[PDB]
């Protein structure tokens, strides 16, 4: 989306990663080298600069049957922040991830990794009593996405149950 938008037009992207372990740097370098003029941001100073930003676009991993979305880490916080400035937040997820799960019906769609991801093992005798933990995902409520970008075109944030009634067999939610 970004590099094809940059293929004719000009902008200035500013990017905070997601880092219990980082991978936003990979996109940062991957579109450092097609001439985009990115800034890579720490994952906390969003609120310092999102007052000055005017649009914000994230890409999730899977979106579910509330019209909602479990995304990568740190998306709920930046999404609520962007609601606080009322600037529109755009999910660029296709018609391919739409899933009949519902958030707290199941057992902890946030689930967890080895926290050596989030702790260096070299600190001493500190780690025995403490039970550190971190998830792989977040959860954003479906009131908060402004507009999908599917393949067929922009669709409503709550355009979802008819998508499931005539894009699935909704009797087969046995799975």
């Amino acid at each position: 989306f970004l590099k094809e938008a940059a293929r004719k037009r000009k902008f200035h992207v500013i990017v905070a990663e997601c880092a219990p372990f980082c991978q936003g740097h990979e996109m940062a370098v991957n579109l450092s080298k097609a001439g985009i003029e990115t800034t890579v941001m720490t994952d906390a100073a969003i609120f310092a600069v999102m007052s000055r930003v005017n649009k914000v676009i994230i890409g999730t991993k899977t979106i579910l049957a509330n019209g909602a979305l479990r995304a990568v880490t740190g998306t709920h916080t930046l999404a609520l922040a962007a609601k606080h400035h009322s600037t529109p937040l755009i999910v660029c997820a296709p018609m391919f991830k739409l899933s009949p799960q519902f958030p707290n019906e199941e057992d902890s769609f946030h689930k967890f990794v080895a926290p050596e991801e989030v702790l260096p093992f070299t600190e001493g005798d500190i780690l025995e009593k403490v039970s550190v933990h971190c998830p792989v995902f977040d959860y954003v409520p479906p009131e908060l996405i402004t507009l999908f970008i599917s393949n067929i075109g922009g669709n409503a944030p709550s355009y979802i149950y008819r998508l499931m009634s005539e894009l699935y067999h909704p009797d087969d939610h046995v799975l």
């Binding site: 509330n66 519902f102 707290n104 019906e105 709550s158 355009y159 979802i160 149950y161």
Partner: protein
């Protein structure tokens, strides 16, 4: 008039089920009637006049349910080739309608009860007849939680939910009606039964609903509502003056604003506060 006495017998002969389903049962058992021997006047005008007579109660659900099974008989009570088996003998389609929306309570019990998060307490509103069975199926599947009830006070009705729940060994505490603002932070998510669901997505129910929803929005906590296939309606409120006055009655039932709810259940399934519109428009083609 001559058969509203049987509706009184159906309201106070088996007081477990709902009012609207007792009305549907009443009239469809009356379809062994004194033979009017016609399709047009009998069905259309006579069941219309029976909806007018049985709508003399202060219910909102009963008349809407009567119109709803009028639409559920408007499907294919056809002109099939002779006046022997049009509907007055081929009558079993309304019977299977009655059976489906009898087992609808059981399928709501099978669906919703695996959503309640164990540990966070859930304050409920006054006694419905679908909150009891979803809590029955929840505690039947070995959960742990707490539950409070507000009184919902024109009359004491929260202790009626207490005498409902306490018979099956589940902890509960009745809490003051105007003081739900104190207990709102204590709960994390809030379920409430329905007298009926509106096309905008809000609910209509006995009075103590909208302040629960707006305190839920202030605490940014999920507001949950539950309804069945009987309780759809065609009303449209904007601010509260426009529920009909015969459906108002110091309100005895009340509307809450449409989409500061967060999630909603029905017999068609768990759905979204704009999906309400298209999924009731699916009914009555």
């Amino acid at each position: 008039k001559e058969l509203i006495e049987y509706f009184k017998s159906q309201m106070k002969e088996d007081p477990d089920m709902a009012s609207a389903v007792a009305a549907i049962r009443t009239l469809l058992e009356f379809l062994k009637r004194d033979k009017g021997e016609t399709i047009q006047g009998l069905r259309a005008n006579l069941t219309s006049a029976i909806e007018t007579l049985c709508g003399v109660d202060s219910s909102v659900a009963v008349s809407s349910g009567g119109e709803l099974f009028l639409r559920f008989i408007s499907l294919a009570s056809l002109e099939y080739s002779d006046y022997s088996k049009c509907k007055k003998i081929m009558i079993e389609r309304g019977e299977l309608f009655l059976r489906r929306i009898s087992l609808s309570r059981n399928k709501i019990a099978d669906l919703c009860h695996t959503f309640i998060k164990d540990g966070a307490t859930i304050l409920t509103h006054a006694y419905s007849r679908v909150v009891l069975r979803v809590l029955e199926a929840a505690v039947a599947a070995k959960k742990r939680f707490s539950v409070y009830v507000t009184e919902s006070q024109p009359d004491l009705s929260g202790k009626k939910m207490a005498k409902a729940l306490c018979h099956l060994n589940v902890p509960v505490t009745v809490v003051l009606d105007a003081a739900v603002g104190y207990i709102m932070e204590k709960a994390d998510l809030v379920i409430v039964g329905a007298e009926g669901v509106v096309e905008n997505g809000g609910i209509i129910n006995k009075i103590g609903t909208n302040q629960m929803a707006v305190c839920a929005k202030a605490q940014n906590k999920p507001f949950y509502v539950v309804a069945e296939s009987f309780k759809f309606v065609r009303l449209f409120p904007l601010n509260q003056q426009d529920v009909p006055d015969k459906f108002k009655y110091h309100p005895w039932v009340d509307y809450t604003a449409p989409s500061l709810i967060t999630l909603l259940f029905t017999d068609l399934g768990v759905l979204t506060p704009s999906a309400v519109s298209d999924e009731l428009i699916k009914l009555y083609l």
